[PDB]
Write a protein that binds this ligand. Structure first.
Ligand code: F6P
Ligand code: F6P
Lengths: 314, 280, 287
């Protein structure tokens, strides 16, 4: 069928890596909406087994891409809460759809509601320092740049120099930007007033898996007591704790770090190149969500009203 | 009134693996088998006499939850014993849930450091070796009851390399420890724990080297105390009943604790407080 | 070669209050009384004396005496005149460290407030002298002492300190973090002071210090001049197995390294020292 082929198309795109995180969540919702429409299912139990199986294969496709797993769990919570309030229900197939639509308009407004709180956290003559290239943080820095005037230091992330296109994006909007070399984070930390970063994933204890320089960044921010603000919406909120059994690191080709033209020493040197870096929650100051700016120590509560505890493990 | 104490001692006798608070709940519920208006007055005397014979926090905490897990329902004595039997059925599965959540936090080839003796840390390691993880355990021979040696004799049967380190040598072997797993004797309202004497300096050393300090408590150990120092722990709990001080418990601040693996899911220390606010 | 060990044990016997390193100095000095092969004989005496005690103080206290006499040999050389300048210089060195504990007490007893409540580790003949001089200056305080397993030296100290009419409490070895807020200051006696200014004391001193800096209690160390050993540990593994071990599996190290960031001041023989200052003195004690 069209839907099945689109499911393995999504899974193989996840495996190979061929988009932003908000587009990832939007495509996941579109896929799961299709799954609950076009498949035949009698009651909610079979559909939860189906959604669980497909979420298991999309999660096992790329386990470090947790936006798809989060949106699978959000849809599962929606299914078991739109079936709870009706407790084979005929209108249930419609009801979940509407909630999914109410989720999809909760999305596409996540970046605006995070950007609305920019002026409350960025002041005139401020110096902000960021790391990766996250669309949430650039909209945050481009909504605060409409009124106030500040300096932003975009420390590039070294293997995939992606703070380059961030500082190109920010300098087009008139923010006076500085590109760093990622070795100077402790050097320029004395000047920096706030650190605003984005995440790949917010783990359930308030810790976060982010771009590979963010822990080396957060240690400097904690050393100089600079507040580390984290701009990240509620699809990036994953209910997984940082256990050693599950691997959260992603490792890419060493050609990003040590090129293939080095030659014979590549048979002896072990080059690694991870792309994600665990930041423990005691180095964090705030999470600017789409629903506010609450502390890391509140994140567990945001788990309980987003994901059911039976849906943590799929 | 007197048969209660000997029956509680019996419930110790036929199974030592069953926790002290669970023994208190069992003898309390069997006392409830034997006017029902103001029956909280009868059971409060039972709680006071049960905390008389055992000074531990869990006996005066788990028994307090059973004083109110039956009082959340407010003849009514039958629904009381039914809901209490459900309470006992759902705390016989506490250690298994804790083990299932916590053994995934031990890396393969790790080297944990534990404290005196606890049926929960022992169960966490028993589930971790049943998941084909391999590690080594450092256990402190905790003075004065020497229960570190009891744990290491109870854990050598699991074919784990266990070392009965000195009680003073925690700061020495803390750098040879990947993570610290202790079993709380009570979890106070701010998320910190009340545990066998020496747990505090295990934590303070651990945070000095950023070793994760994991606590594996249970749901009934959530007590409503809020200590601010080691003074604020009551003398009911500290003193079990050449000048010597000799407490038996001390308070560990919630900043020193990385995570609690309680019965009701993995919690940050800050996540403990509303889990006490919900029970009120 | 064997009578050396017997004489060292005798100096332990008829003088228990005398330090282990001073006993090593005395027996090695008598061995000196019995050109450049004599330096090799004294080095063999160091090896045989450290082989039977294994404290940091013995292999440091005797090792300064290998240098306090060889410094005079840099000035002049002889065959028997050098031996006599060696014995009149070693006697000066030995009688200049018989006054060490009194100098440490005079410097350190002014750091105890009236009505204070100190915390001390196992048993130090220097901490005992600091408190003995502090009660002789009409200060009154409380002493918390850890029993400090395995040899229970804390009970020996509290029995040796109850005669001073001081309220002394033999706290449990695990309960440092408990009573640590009941302590105004921490006084410990180092068994050796390493090159960064940190100390090597009986096991459990480290977690006494780590708790101290956790509550900003001042952690005072009362060592002596001959305990300045030239080691530079970076962790507890870097302490040699010579010093850690005197001999369901037991581990039992007997010493552990305390980082110099945890130490507030050292009350050595040669004045009150910042932990940084120790390093300079070590350079001066080895050029
Ligand atoms: O055996 P339990 O119920 O886990 O008790 C945990 C704690 O209580 C003690 O057994 C007594 O304090 C401690 O040794 C232990 O850390
Ligand atoms: O003061 P003393 O007797 O020379 O030794 C000081 C330290 O060495 C020990 O006696 C043994 O390590 C410790 O008890 C003491 O802290």
């Amino acid at each position: 069928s069209e839907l099945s082929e689109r499911i393995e198309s999504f899974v193989e795109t996840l495996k190979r890596g061929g988009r932003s995180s908000e587009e990832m969540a939007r495509e996941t919702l579109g896929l799961l909406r299709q799954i609950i429409t076009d498949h035949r299912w009698s009651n909610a139990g079979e559909l939860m087994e189906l959604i669980r199986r497909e979420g298991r294969r999309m999660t096992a496709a790329q386990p470090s891409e947790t936006t798809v797993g989060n949106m699978v769990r959000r849809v599962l919570k929606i299914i078991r809460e739109e079936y709870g309030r009706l407790h084979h229900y005929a209108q249930l197939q419609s009801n979940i759809i509407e909630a999914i639509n109410e989720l999809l308009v909760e999305l596409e407004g996540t970046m605006e509601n995070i950007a609305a709180q920019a002026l409350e956290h960025i002041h005139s003559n401020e110096v902000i320092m960021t790391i990766g290239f996250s669309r949430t943080v650039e909209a945050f820095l481009k909504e605060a740049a409409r009124k106030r005037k500040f300096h932003v230091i975009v420390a590039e992330c070294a293997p995939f120099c992606q703070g380059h296109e961030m500082a190109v994006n920010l300098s087009k909007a008139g923010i006076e930007t500085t590109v760093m070399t990622d070795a100077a984070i402790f050097a320029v930390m004395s000047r920096v007033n706030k650190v605003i970063i984005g995440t790949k994933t917010i783990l359930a204890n308030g810790a976060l898996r982010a771009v590979t320089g963010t822990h080396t960044l957060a240690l400097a921010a904690k050393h100089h007591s600079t507040p580390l603000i984290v701009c990240a919406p509620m699809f990036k909120l994953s209910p997984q704790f940082p256990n050693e059994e599950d691997s959260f690191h992603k490792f890419v080709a060493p050609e990003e770090v040590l090129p293939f033209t080095e030659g014979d020493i590549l048979e002896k040197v072990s080059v690694h190149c991870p792309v994600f870096d665990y930041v423990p929650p005691e180095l964090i100051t705030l999470f600017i969500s789409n629903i506010g700016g609450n502390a890391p120590s509140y994140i567990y509560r945001l788990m309980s009203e987003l994901y059911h505890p039976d849906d943590h493990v799929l | 009134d007197k048969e209660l104490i000997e029956y509680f001692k019996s419930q110790m006798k036929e199974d030592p693996d069953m926790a002290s608070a669970v023994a208190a709940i069992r003898t309390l519920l069997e006392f409830l088998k034997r006017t029902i208006q103001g029956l909280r007055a009868n059971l409060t005397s039972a709680i006071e006499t049960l905390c008389g014979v055992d000074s531990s926090v869990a006996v005066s905490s788990g028994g307090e939850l059973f004083l109110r897990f039956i009082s959340l329902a407010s003849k009514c004595k039958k629904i009381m014993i039914e809901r209490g039997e459900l309470f006992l059925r759902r705390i016989s599965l506490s250690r298994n849930k804790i083990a299932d959540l916590c053994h995934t936090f031990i890396k393969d080839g790790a080297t944990i450091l534990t404290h005196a003796y606890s049926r929960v840390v022992l169960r966490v390691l028993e589930a971790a070796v049943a998941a084909k993880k391999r590690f080594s355990v450092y256990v402190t021979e905790s003075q004065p009851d020497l229960s570190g040696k009891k744990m290491a004799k109870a854990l050598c049967h699991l074919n784990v390399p266990v070392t009965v380190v000195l009680d003073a040598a925690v700061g020495y072997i803390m750098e040879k420890a990947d993570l610290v797993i202790v079993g709380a004797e009570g979890v106070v309202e701010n998320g910190g724990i009340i545990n066998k004497i020496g747990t505090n300096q295990m934590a303070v050393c651990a945070k000095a080297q950023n070793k994760p300090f994991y606590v594996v408590a249970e749901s009934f150990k959530f007590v409503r105390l809020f200590p601010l120092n080691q003074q604020d722990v009551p003398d009911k709990f500290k003193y079990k009943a050449l000048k010597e001080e000799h407490p038996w418990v001390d308070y560990t601040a919630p900043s020193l604790i990385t995570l609690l693996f309680t019965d009701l899911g993995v919690l940050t220390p800050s996540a403990v407080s509303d889990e006490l606010i919900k029970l009120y």
